[PDB]
Amino acid sequence: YEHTAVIPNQVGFPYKAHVAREGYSPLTLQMQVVETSLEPTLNLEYITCDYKTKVPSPYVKCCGTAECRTQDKPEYKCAVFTGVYPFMWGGAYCFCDSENTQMSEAYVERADVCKHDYAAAYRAHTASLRAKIKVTYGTVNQTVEAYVNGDHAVTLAGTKFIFGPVSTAWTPFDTKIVVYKGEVYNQDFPPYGAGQPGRFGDIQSRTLDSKDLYANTGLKLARPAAGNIHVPYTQTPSGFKTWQKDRDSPLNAKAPFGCTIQTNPVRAMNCAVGNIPVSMDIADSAFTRLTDAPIISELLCTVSTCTHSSDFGGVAVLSYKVEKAGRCDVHSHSNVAVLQEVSIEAEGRSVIHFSTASAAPSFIVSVCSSRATCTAKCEPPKDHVVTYPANHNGITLPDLSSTAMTWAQHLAGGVGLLIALAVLILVIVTCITLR
């Protein structure tokens, strides 16, 4: 026999549904989710890391001028300076005093710590999500992991579960994210090869091995001092290690629905929005036919205590005449109060717990195939802050017959009444004035 239902996506919450086949005793299932991942798809676009310069050992030859040659490496700049007269440690270096010339070169490369430390960019797309559900009934506790796009079945002892696709598939990401060591950000990074100096994305590369760079930090070469040997050097300072101290607040603090992150693969867990549908193919060796089905009649329910509040703070007893021992099943057929236990015991009186966030509930309950009702009046608790949430639907609406709005029909009927003598005493002379 096959069935369909919907369950709310919120961790640690009971929900329950039926089958009522024909002939046989009823059967009540409960469904409860324990985990909910989420996963987008990525494709890399570039990386960045810190860099380092090199100034390899400038060249002097005296009374003979120069010429330097070009060569392939990113951001190579050579220069040529006339009229230099150094003065090294031992004495004066060489004496062809007027006509001396000197060259200089330097370049930029990646540092030695890039293969442990980098900050990469990415791009997002449509995403899929998977859940873990604990389902119990009959004589069996089981749990099951499942994809949520509507194609993946799974086998319990004879039964098939396939899940509805989604309510809606929005995500707490937009199209461009950037990931650096255990938290994800939300930037808008420059495209490629257009990083102006100083800010983020100053050194690019695709997949992190080698051979290709991009570097525009504005190298210029300056004139050396009067009577020394060094190489001067001028540069706007680096762009990576000026980002990781004056940064932002991360995305682990402005996530919308409690949606927590941890990422060697990027995820978003326990994210609590919406409904997930479920459908059911149920086997046949998990019912009871009629032989051990007890017959129960003249059911009468009362109440003794209630609060609102946030847990199982409503108690009720039951009265019934038995004929045979066994085990029946219980349910309340309305959305205003959910019960606690999944199977009452046999002969005598027995109690049931329930919770309801309303002033005056009324519903109909049925331990086995006979039905009954019982209603109550309620009062608020004296507290303000709890540590554990939400064990009711959250519907606080008035009933059709309460102390509160039994006042309502008297006033509306009362105001409905006094026009009624007014309407006809108009008319009773309205005929006679056509004499």
Q: Which residues bind another protein (CB under 8 A)?
A: 411, 415, 418-419, 422, 425-426, 429, 433
CA distance 40 to 169: 11
Q: Which is nearer to another protein, 232 or 416 (CB)?
A: 416
Q: Which is nearer to another protein, 394 or 414 (CB)?
A: 414
Q: Which is nearer to another protein, 343 or 409 (CB)?
A: 409
DSSP string over 256-319? TTS-B---SS---BS---SEEEEEEE--STTS--STT----EEEEE---EE--SSSS-EEEEEE
CA distance 81 to 230: 13
DSSP string over 26-94? PEEEEEEEEEE--B-------EE--EEEE----EEEESS-------SSTT-EEEEEES-----SSS---
Please report how close the Cβ of residue 405 comes to another protein at its closest, in angstroms: 12
Of 300, 272, 281, nearest in space to 375 by CA: 300
Residue located via tokens 């039964």: 159
CA angle in degrees (0–180, nearest 5) for 131-134-139: 155
Q: Which is nearer to another protein, 400 or 415 (CB)?
A: 415
Question: Cβ contacts of residue 240 below 8 Å, gap of 6+?
Answer: 48, 49, 50, 51, 119, 200, 202, 203
Please report how close the Cβ of residue 355 comes to another protein at its closest, in angstroms: 25
Q: Which is nearer to another protein, 253 or 415 (CB)?
A: 415
Please report how close the Cβ of residue 307 comes to another protein at its closest, in angstroms: 23
Please report how close the Cβ of residue 415 comes to another protein at its closest, in angstroms: 6
Quick check: 75 and 216 in contact, CB under 8 A?
yes
Q: Which is nearer to another protein, 20 or 417 (CB)?
A: 417
Q: Which is nearer to another protein, 226 or 423 (CB)?
A: 423
Please report how close the Cβ of residue 390 comes to another protein at its closest, in angstroms: 24
- Going edge to edge, which strands form the sheet with 140-147? 15-19, 27-36, 130-137, 140-147
Please report how close the Cβ of residue 417 comes to another protein at its closest, in angstroms: 11
Q: Which is nearer to another protein, 343 or 430 (CB)?
A: 430
Please report how close the Cβ of residue 10 comes to another protein at its closest, in angstroms: 29
**Tally of CB atoms within 10 A around 227:** 10
Please report how close the Cβ of residue 408 comes to another protein at its closest, in angstroms: 9
